[PDB]
Design a protein around this ligand. Sequence first.
Ligand SMILES: Nc1nc2c(ncn2[C@@H]2O[C@H](COP(=O)(O)OP(=O)(O)OP(=O)(O)O)[C@@H](O)[C@H]2O)c(=O)[nH]1
Ligand SMILES: [Mg+2]
Ligand SMILES: [Zn+2]
Ligand SMILES: [Zn+2]
Ligand SMILES: [Zn+2]
Ligand SMILES: [Zn+2]
Lengths: 247, 176
Amino acid sequence: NAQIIFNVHPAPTRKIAVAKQNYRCAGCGIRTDPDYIKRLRYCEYLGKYFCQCCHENAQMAIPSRVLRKWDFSKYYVSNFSKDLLIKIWNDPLFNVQDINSALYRKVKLLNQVRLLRVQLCHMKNMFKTCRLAKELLDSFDTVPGHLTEDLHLYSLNDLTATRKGELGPRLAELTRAGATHVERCMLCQAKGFICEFCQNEDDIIFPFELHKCRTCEECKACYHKACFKSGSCPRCERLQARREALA
Amino acid sequence: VLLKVIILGDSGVGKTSLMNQYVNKKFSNQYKATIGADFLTKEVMVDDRLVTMQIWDTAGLERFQSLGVAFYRGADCCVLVFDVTAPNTFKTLDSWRDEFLIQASPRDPENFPFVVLGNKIDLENRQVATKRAQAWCYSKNNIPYFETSAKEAINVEQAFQTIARNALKQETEVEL
Ligand SMILES: Nc1nc2c(ncn2[C@@H]2O[C@H](COP(=O)(O)OP(=O)(O)OP(=O)(O)O)[C@@H](O)[C@H]2O)c(=O)[nH]1
Ligand SMILES: [Mg+2]
Ligand SMILES: [Zn+2]
Ligand SMILES: [Zn+2]
Ligand SMILES: [Zn+2]
Ligand SMILES: [Zn+2]
Protein backbone atom coordinates (compact mmCIF):
# COMPACT_ATOMS: atom_id res chain seq x y z
CA ASN A 1 0.00 0.00 0.00
CA ALA A 2 2.57 2.59 -1.13
CA GLN A 3 1.49 6.22 -1.36
CA ILE A 4 1.59 8.02 -4.73
CA ILE A 5 3.64 11.20 -4.42
CA PHE A 6 5.86 11.59 -7.49
CA ASN A 7 4.13 14.01 -9.86
CA VAL A 8 5.25 15.45 -13.19
CA HIS A 9 2.50 18.09 -12.78
CA PRO A 10 2.52 19.30 -9.16
CA ALA A 11 0.13 22.04 -8.12
CA PRO A 12 1.44 25.19 -9.86
CA THR A 13 1.06 27.46 -6.80
CA ARG A 14 3.10 25.08 -4.64
CA LYS A 15 5.73 24.62 -7.37
CA ILE A 16 6.08 28.41 -7.35
CA ALA A 17 6.51 28.51 -3.56
CA VAL A 18 8.85 25.56 -3.11
CA ALA A 19 10.97 26.82 -6.00
CA LYS A 20 11.10 30.29 -4.47
CA GLN A 21 13.02 28.68 -1.58
CA ASN A 22 15.38 26.76 -3.87
CA TYR A 23 13.54 23.54 -3.07
CA ARG A 24 15.01 23.72 0.45
CA CYS A 25 13.09 22.92 3.62
CA ALA A 26 12.62 26.19 5.48
CA GLY A 27 13.64 24.65 8.82
CA CYS A 28 16.60 22.32 8.20
CA GLY A 29 17.59 23.44 4.66
CA ILE A 30 17.30 19.92 3.21
CA ARG A 31 17.14 20.02 -0.58
CA THR A 32 14.03 18.19 -1.77
CA ASP A 33 13.19 16.37 -4.98
CA PRO A 34 11.22 18.79 -7.21
CA ASP A 35 9.12 15.79 -8.36
CA TYR A 36 8.03 15.07 -4.75
CA ILE A 37 6.95 18.47 -3.33
CA LYS A 38 3.51 17.11 -2.37
CA ARG A 39 5.33 15.65 0.68
CA LEU A 40 6.01 19.13 2.10
CA ARG A 41 3.71 21.00 4.50
CA TYR A 42 2.82 24.71 4.54
CA CYS A 43 3.48 26.62 7.74
CA GLU A 44 0.60 29.06 7.94
CA TYR A 45 2.62 31.44 10.14
CA LEU A 46 6.03 31.64 8.48
CA GLY A 47 4.50 31.33 5.00
CA LYS A 48 7.06 28.77 3.80
CA TYR A 49 7.19 25.02 3.11
CA PHE A 50 8.83 22.42 5.36
CA CYS A 51 9.85 18.74 5.30
CA GLN A 52 7.72 16.34 7.36
CA CYS A 53 10.38 16.25 10.09
CA CYS A 54 10.56 20.01 10.77
CA HIS A 55 6.75 20.31 10.38
CA GLU A 56 4.57 17.71 12.15
CA ASN A 57 1.12 19.38 11.88
CA ALA A 58 1.18 21.28 15.16
CA GLN A 59 -1.74 23.70 15.34
CA MET A 60 -1.64 27.33 16.44
CA ALA A 61 -3.59 30.56 16.05
CA ILE A 62 -1.90 32.95 13.65
CA PRO A 63 -0.98 36.61 14.42
CA SER A 64 -1.93 38.02 11.00
CA ARG A 65 -5.17 36.04 11.06
CA VAL A 66 -6.03 37.55 14.48
CA LEU A 67 -5.24 41.10 13.34
CA ARG A 68 -7.02 41.04 9.94
CA LYS A 69 -10.20 39.20 11.01
CA TRP A 70 -10.87 38.24 14.63
CA ASP A 71 -9.83 34.69 13.81
CA PHE A 72 -8.41 32.58 16.64
CA SER A 73 -8.84 29.19 14.97
CA LYS A 74 -5.71 27.06 14.93
CA TYR A 75 -3.76 26.43 11.73
CA TYR A 76 -1.04 23.97 10.78
CA VAL A 77 2.32 25.45 11.80
CA SER A 78 5.90 24.25 11.51
CA ASN A 79 7.62 23.13 14.71
CA PHE A 80 9.85 26.23 14.60
CA SER A 81 6.78 28.49 14.42
CA LYS A 82 4.87 26.74 17.20
CA ASP A 83 7.97 27.07 19.37
CA LEU A 84 8.47 30.74 18.55
CA LEU A 85 4.85 31.81 18.89
CA ILE A 86 4.77 30.15 22.31
CA LYS A 87 7.91 32.05 23.28
CA ILE A 88 6.56 35.53 22.36
CA TRP A 89 3.11 34.94 23.86
CA ASN A 90 3.36 37.71 26.49
CA ASP A 91 5.61 40.02 24.39
CA PRO A 92 3.97 43.36 23.34
CA LEU A 93 4.80 43.07 19.65
CA PHE A 94 1.58 43.74 17.70
CA ASN A 95 0.50 47.34 16.96
CA VAL A 96 -3.20 47.18 16.00
CA GLN A 97 -3.39 50.74 14.64
CA ASP A 98 -0.21 50.28 12.55
CA ILE A 99 -1.21 46.84 11.20
CA ASN A 100 -5.00 47.13 10.79
CA SER A 101 -6.90 50.08 12.25
CA ALA A 102 -10.24 48.79 10.90
CA LEU A 103 -10.26 45.96 13.46
CA TYR A 104 -11.06 48.51 16.19
CA ARG A 105 -14.56 48.92 14.68
CA LYS A 106 -15.26 45.22 14.04
CA VAL A 107 -14.46 44.01 17.60
CA LYS A 108 -16.33 45.71 20.39
CA LEU A 109 -14.47 43.97 23.20
CA LEU A 110 -11.24 45.25 21.64
CA ASN A 111 -12.42 48.86 21.23
CA GLN A 112 -13.45 48.69 24.87
CA VAL A 113 -9.91 47.92 25.99
CA ARG A 114 -8.51 50.50 23.56
CA LEU A 115 -10.75 53.04 25.26
CA LEU A 116 -9.96 51.66 28.72
CA ARG A 117 -6.27 51.87 27.82
CA VAL A 118 -6.58 55.49 26.65
CA GLN A 119 -7.96 56.48 30.05
CA LEU A 120 -5.31 54.45 31.93
CA CYS A 121 -2.47 56.25 30.09
CA HIS A 122 -3.82 59.64 31.15
CA MET A 123 -4.48 58.49 34.70
CA LYS A 124 -0.92 57.13 34.86
CA ASN A 125 0.65 60.46 33.81
CA MET A 126 -1.26 62.23 36.56
CA PHE A 127 -0.45 59.63 39.22
CA LYS A 128 3.25 59.91 38.31
CA THR A 129 3.13 63.55 39.49
CA CYS A 130 0.75 63.25 42.48
CA ARG A 131 2.64 62.25 45.62
CA LEU A 132 -0.59 61.08 47.29
CA ALA A 133 -1.54 58.53 44.61
CA LYS A 134 1.42 56.15 44.99
CA GLU A 135 -0.50 53.08 46.09
CA LEU A 136 -2.67 53.60 42.99
CA LEU A 137 0.46 53.53 40.81
CA ASP A 138 1.33 50.17 42.33
CA SER A 139 -2.10 48.81 41.36
CA PHE A 140 -1.43 49.94 37.79
CA ASP A 141 1.30 47.29 37.60
CA THR A 142 -0.91 44.35 38.51
CA VAL A 143 -1.45 44.32 34.72
CA PRO A 144 1.31 44.13 32.06
CA GLY A 145 3.50 47.20 31.82
CA HIS A 146 2.56 48.14 28.26
CA LEU A 147 -1.22 48.25 28.73
CA THR A 148 -1.02 51.54 30.63
CA GLU A 149 2.00 53.18 29.01
CA ASP A 150 1.07 52.50 25.37
CA LEU A 151 -2.27 52.40 23.59
CA HIS A 152 -1.90 50.27 20.46
CA LEU A 153 0.52 47.49 21.42
CA TYR A 154 -0.90 44.10 22.29
CA SER A 155 0.62 40.71 22.93
CA LEU A 156 -1.06 37.47 21.87
CA ASN A 157 -1.99 37.05 25.55
CA ASP A 158 -3.85 40.38 25.58
CA LEU A 159 -5.62 39.67 22.30
CA THR A 160 -6.88 36.33 23.60
CA ALA A 161 -7.73 37.67 27.08
CA THR A 162 -9.74 40.36 25.23
CA ARG A 163 -11.68 37.73 23.24
CA LYS A 164 -12.30 35.73 26.41
CA GLY A 165 -13.68 39.09 27.64
CA GLU A 166 -11.51 39.22 30.79
CA LEU A 167 -9.06 42.03 29.94
CA GLY A 168 -11.68 44.80 30.02
CA PRO A 169 -12.81 43.72 33.51
CA ARG A 170 -9.30 43.90 34.98
CA LEU A 171 -8.91 47.30 33.31
CA ALA A 172 -12.36 48.64 34.21
CA GLU A 173 -11.47 47.87 37.85
CA LEU A 174 -8.51 50.25 37.40
CA THR A 175 -10.16 53.12 35.48
CA ARG A 176 -12.60 53.32 38.43
CA ALA A 177 -10.12 53.36 41.30
CA GLY A 178 -8.33 56.07 39.33
CA ALA A 179 -11.47 58.04 38.53
CA THR A 180 -12.39 58.20 42.23
CA HIS A 181 -8.90 59.24 43.36
CA VAL A 182 -9.10 62.23 40.99
CA GLU A 183 -12.61 63.10 42.18
CA ARG A 184 -11.41 63.08 45.82
CA CYS A 185 -7.72 64.17 45.59
CA MET A 186 -7.40 67.76 44.47
CA LEU A 187 -3.69 67.68 43.88
CA CYS A 188 -4.97 65.85 40.80
CA GLN A 189 -7.89 68.26 40.41
CA ALA A 190 -5.27 71.05 40.30
CA LYS A 191 -3.71 69.44 37.20
CA GLY A 192 -7.12 69.38 35.51
CA PHE A 193 -7.90 71.65 32.56
CA ILE A 194 -10.03 74.66 31.73
CA CYS A 195 -11.29 74.74 28.13
CA GLU A 196 -9.33 77.54 26.41
CA PHE A 197 -12.33 78.20 24.11
CA CYS A 198 -15.22 78.73 26.55
CA GLN A 199 -13.16 79.41 29.69
CA ASN A 200 -15.84 77.88 31.89
CA GLU A 201 -13.92 77.70 35.15
CA ASP A 202 -16.82 75.72 36.71
CA ASP A 203 -16.18 72.53 34.67
CA ILE A 204 -12.61 71.30 35.15
CA ILE A 205 -12.07 68.57 32.54
CA PHE A 206 -9.44 65.82 32.55
CA PRO A 207 -8.05 64.00 29.49
CA PHE A 208 -9.43 60.56 30.48
CA GLU A 209 -13.05 61.79 30.35
CA LEU A 210 -13.50 60.98 26.68
CA HIS A 211 -17.28 61.36 26.97
CA LYS A 212 -16.87 65.10 27.70
CA CYS A 213 -13.78 66.36 25.95
CA ARG A 214 -11.36 65.64 23.13
CA THR A 215 -7.62 65.99 23.74
CA CYS A 216 -5.34 67.53 21.17
CA GLU A 217 -2.51 65.10 20.56
CA GLU A 218 0.07 67.55 19.32
CA CYS A 219 -0.31 69.88 22.34
CA LYS A 220 -2.23 67.38 24.54
CA ALA A 221 -4.23 70.41 25.69
CA CYS A 222 -7.74 69.39 26.67
CA TYR A 223 -10.88 71.03 25.28
CA HIS A 224 -14.60 70.24 25.34
CA LYS A 225 -15.84 68.20 22.39
CA ALA A 226 -18.42 70.92 21.72
CA CYS A 227 -15.72 73.64 21.67
CA PHE A 228 -13.01 71.96 19.56
CA LYS A 229 -13.63 69.60 16.58
CA SER A 230 -13.94 72.60 14.22
CA GLY A 231 -10.66 74.33 13.44
CA SER A 232 -7.23 74.23 15.01
CA CYS A 233 -5.84 74.15 18.59
CA PRO A 234 -5.19 77.62 20.08
CA ARG A 235 -2.23 76.43 22.18
CA CYS A 236 0.03 75.71 19.18
CA GLU A 237 -1.17 78.82 17.32
CA ARG A 238 0.81 80.78 19.94
CA LEU A 239 3.68 78.36 20.69
CA GLN A 240 4.78 78.41 17.05
CA ALA A 241 3.93 82.06 16.55
CA ARG A 242 6.46 82.39 19.42
CA ARG A 243 9.56 81.06 17.69
CA GLU A 244 7.96 82.83 14.68
CA ALA A 245 8.76 86.31 16.05
CA LEU A 246 12.01 85.09 17.67
CA ALA A 247 13.59 83.85 14.38
CA VAL B 1 -9.10 85.46 54.08
CA LEU B 2 -7.00 83.10 51.87
CA LEU B 3 -4.57 84.14 49.12
CA LYS B 4 -3.46 81.94 46.23
CA VAL B 5 0.06 82.64 44.90
CA ILE B 6 1.58 80.91 41.84
CA ILE B 7 5.34 80.68 41.21
CA LEU B 8 6.43 80.36 37.56
CA GLY B 9 9.75 80.44 35.73
CA ASP B 10 12.30 78.29 33.91
CA SER B 11 13.66 75.12 35.46
CA GLY B 12 16.45 75.52 37.98
CA VAL B 13 16.01 79.25 38.60
CA GLY B 14 15.14 78.66 42.27
CA LYS B 15 11.33 78.45 42.60
CA THR B 16 11.30 75.50 45.02
CA SER B 17 14.21 77.06 46.97
CA LEU B 18 12.78 80.59 47.29
CA MET B 19 9.59 79.03 48.61
CA ASN B 20 11.44 76.64 50.96
CA GLN B 21 13.56 79.56 52.19
CA TYR B 22 10.48 81.76 52.75
CA VAL B 23 8.18 79.23 54.37
CA ASN B 24 10.79 77.27 56.35
CA LYS B 25 13.92 79.49 56.48
CA LYS B 26 15.72 76.42 55.05
CA PHE B 27 17.96 75.91 52.03
CA SER B 28 19.66 72.83 50.61
CA ASN B 29 22.03 72.99 47.65
CA GLN B 30 20.98 69.57 46.35
CA TYR B 31 18.78 70.14 43.28
CA LYS B 32 15.51 68.16 43.16
CA ALA B 33 13.45 68.88 40.03
CA THR B 34 9.80 69.38 40.95
CA ILE B 35 7.65 67.14 38.75
CA GLY B 36 4.15 68.17 39.76
CA ALA B 37 2.59 71.35 41.09
CA ASP B 38 2.06 71.39 44.86
CA PHE B 39 1.73 74.03 47.55
CA LEU B 40 2.78 75.23 50.99
CA THR B 41 0.89 77.53 53.36
CA LYS B 42 2.20 80.41 55.47
CA GLU B 43 0.02 82.45 57.78
CA VAL B 44 0.92 86.13 58.01
CA MET B 45 -0.93 89.12 59.44
CA VAL B 46 -1.75 92.47 57.80
CA ASP B 47 -3.40 95.12 60.04
CA ASP B 48 -4.82 93.00 62.90
CA ARG B 49 -6.27 90.78 60.13
CA LEU B 50 -5.22 87.13 59.84
CA VAL B 51 -4.49 86.02 56.27
CA THR B 52 -3.22 82.72 54.82
CA MET B 53 -1.10 82.43 51.69
CA GLN B 54 -1.21 79.32 49.52
CA ILE B 55 1.97 79.31 47.43
CA TRP B 56 2.16 77.00 44.39
CA ASP B 57 5.46 76.14 42.77
CA THR B 58 5.53 74.62 39.36
CA ALA B 59 7.55 72.21 37.22
CA GLY B 60 9.64 74.53 35.07
CA LEU B 61 11.40 71.65 33.26
CA GLU B 62 9.00 70.06 30.75
CA ARG B 63 6.40 68.10 32.69
CA PHE B 64 3.65 70.37 31.31
CA GLN B 65 2.14 68.41 28.46
CA SER B 66 -1.00 66.26 28.89
CA LEU B 67 -1.22 67.81 32.37
CA GLY B 68 -3.46 70.78 33.01
CA VAL B 69 -3.17 73.94 35.02
CA ALA B 70 -6.68 74.56 36.35
CA PHE B 71 -5.05 75.64 39.64
CA TYR B 72 -4.18 79.05 38.13
CA ARG B 73 -7.82 80.09 38.54
CA GLY B 74 -8.41 82.40 41.46
CA ALA B 75 -4.74 83.36 41.51
CA ASP B 76 -4.52 86.54 43.49
CA CYS B 77 -0.83 87.10 42.57
CA CYS B 78 1.69 85.56 40.13
CA VAL B 79 5.45 85.36 40.76
CA LEU B 80 8.00 85.19 37.94
CA VAL B 81 11.47 83.93 38.90
CA PHE B 82 14.55 84.28 36.73
CA ASP B 83 18.23 83.50 37.28
CA VAL B 84 20.45 86.59 37.16
CA THR B 85 23.34 84.37 35.99
CA ALA B 86 21.48 82.62 33.12
CA PRO B 87 20.37 85.45 30.79
CA ASN B 88 18.04 83.20 28.77
CA THR B 89 15.57 82.75 31.63
CA PHE B 90 15.21 86.54 31.89
CA LYS B 91 14.38 86.39 28.15
CA THR B 92 11.59 83.85 28.64
CA LEU B 93 9.88 86.21 31.11
CA ASP B 94 7.44 87.55 28.48
CA SER B 95 6.57 83.94 27.59
CA TRP B 96 5.52 83.14 31.17
CA ARG B 97 3.37 86.21 31.86
CA ASP B 98 1.67 85.97 28.45
CA GLU B 99 0.73 82.33 28.98
CA PHE B 100 -0.42 82.88 32.56
CA LEU B 101 -2.81 85.67 31.60
CA ILE B 102 -4.23 83.19 29.07
CA GLN B 103 -4.72 80.27 31.46
CA ALA B 104 -5.87 82.08 34.65
CA SER B 105 -7.86 84.71 32.71
CA PRO B 106 -8.53 87.54 35.21
CA ARG B 107 -10.67 90.58 34.53
CA ASP B 108 -8.34 93.44 33.61
CA PRO B 109 -5.22 91.34 32.97
CA GLU B 110 -2.86 94.32 32.65
CA ASN B 111 -3.73 95.61 36.13
CA PHE B 112 -3.10 92.09 37.55
CA PRO B 113 -0.33 91.80 40.16
CA PHE B 114 2.99 90.38 39.05
CA VAL B 115 6.15 90.22 41.15
CA VAL B 116 9.48 89.54 39.48
CA LEU B 117 12.33 87.85 41.36
CA GLY B 118 15.90 87.93 40.11
CA ASN B 119 17.35 84.96 41.98
CA LYS B 120 20.95 83.97 42.80
CA ILE B 121 22.49 87.42 43.40
CA ASP B 122 25.02 85.72 45.73
CA LEU B 123 26.90 84.15 42.80
CA GLU B 124 29.51 86.13 40.87
CA ASN B 125 28.71 85.35 37.21
CA ARG B 126 25.77 87.76 37.22
CA GLN B 127 24.82 88.64 33.62
CA VAL B 128 21.48 90.48 33.68
CA ALA B 129 21.84 94.05 34.88
CA THR B 130 19.62 95.41 37.62
CA LYS B 131 18.76 98.57 35.65
CA ARG B 132 17.86 96.33 32.69
CA ALA B 133 15.41 94.17 34.62
CA GLN B 134 14.06 97.20 36.52
CA ALA B 135 13.21 98.72 33.14
CA TRP B 136 11.44 95.60 31.84
CA CYS B 137 9.15 95.56 34.88
CA TYR B 138 8.51 99.28 34.49
CA SER B 139 7.34 98.43 30.97
CA LYS B 140 4.61 96.04 32.19
CA ASN B 141 2.37 98.35 34.25
CA ASN B 142 4.99 99.04 36.89
CA ILE B 143 5.46 95.64 38.51
CA PRO B 144 7.73 95.06 41.54
CA TYR B 145 11.27 93.78 41.08
CA PHE B 146 13.39 92.02 43.70
CA GLU B 147 16.95 90.74 43.43
CA THR B 148 16.98 87.76 45.77
CA SER B 149 19.03 84.83 47.00
CA ALA B 150 17.34 81.75 48.40
CA LYS B 151 20.84 80.75 49.55
CA GLU B 152 21.59 83.78 51.72
CA ALA B 153 18.02 84.97 52.53
CA ILE B 154 18.50 88.18 50.56
CA ASN B 155 15.22 90.06 49.96
CA VAL B 156 13.20 86.87 50.29
CA GLU B 157 11.09 88.05 53.20
CA GLN B 158 10.81 91.41 51.41
CA ALA B 159 9.48 89.84 48.20
CA PHE B 160 6.90 87.53 49.70
CA GLN B 161 5.56 90.37 51.88
CA THR B 162 5.06 92.44 48.74
CA ILE B 163 3.39 89.37 47.15
CA ALA B 164 1.11 89.06 50.18
CA ARG B 165 0.32 92.79 50.16
CA ASN B 166 -0.43 92.81 46.41
CA ALA B 167 -2.42 89.56 46.48
CA LEU B 168 -4.47 90.90 49.42
CA LYS B 169 -5.36 93.93 47.33
CA GLN B 170 -6.21 91.73 44.30
CA GLU B 171 -8.39 89.32 46.35
CA THR B 172 -10.56 92.03 47.86
CA GLU B 173 -11.63 93.33 44.38
CA VAL B 174 -13.09 90.52 42.31
CA GLU B 175 -15.39 90.24 45.29
CA LEU B 176 -16.53 93.73 44.14
N1 LIG C 1 23.73 80.31 45.01
C1 LIG C 1 22.42 80.15 44.91
N2 LIG C 1 21.87 78.95 44.48
C2 LIG C 1 20.53 78.80 44.38
C3 LIG C 1 19.69 79.87 44.70
N3 LIG C 1 18.40 79.45 44.51
C4 LIG C 1 18.43 78.18 44.08
N4 LIG C 1 19.73 77.76 43.99
C5 LIG C 1 20.14 76.42 43.57
O1 LIG C 1 19.81 76.21 42.20
C6 LIG C 1 19.34 74.88 41.99
C7 LIG C 1 17.98 74.91 41.27
O2 LIG C 1 16.95 75.58 42.01
P1 LIG C 1 15.56 74.87 42.48
O3 LIG C 1 14.70 75.81 43.28
O4 LIG C 1 15.76 73.57 43.25
O5 LIG C 1 14.83 74.47 41.11
P2 LIG C 1 13.44 75.06 40.61
O6 LIG C 1 13.53 76.52 40.23
O7 LIG C 1 12.29 74.73 41.55
O8 LIG C 1 13.29 74.27 39.23
P3 LIG C 1 12.21 73.09 39.16
O9 LIG C 1 12.04 72.47 40.56
O10 LIG C 1 12.71 72.11 38.13
O11 LIG C 1 10.91 73.66 38.63
C8 LIG C 1 19.26 74.22 43.36
O12 LIG C 1 20.41 73.44 43.58
C9 LIG C 1 19.31 75.38 44.33
O13 LIG C 1 19.86 74.96 45.56
C10 LIG C 1 20.24 81.08 45.13
O14 LIG C 1 19.53 82.04 45.42
N5 LIG C 1 21.60 81.21 45.23
MG1 LIG D 1 10.68 73.15 41.63
ZN1 LIG E 1 13.14 20.20 7.18
ZN1 LIG F 1 -3.81 62.47 43.44
ZN1 LIG G 1 -15.17 74.32 26.40
ZN1 LIG H 1 -3.16 71.44 19.27
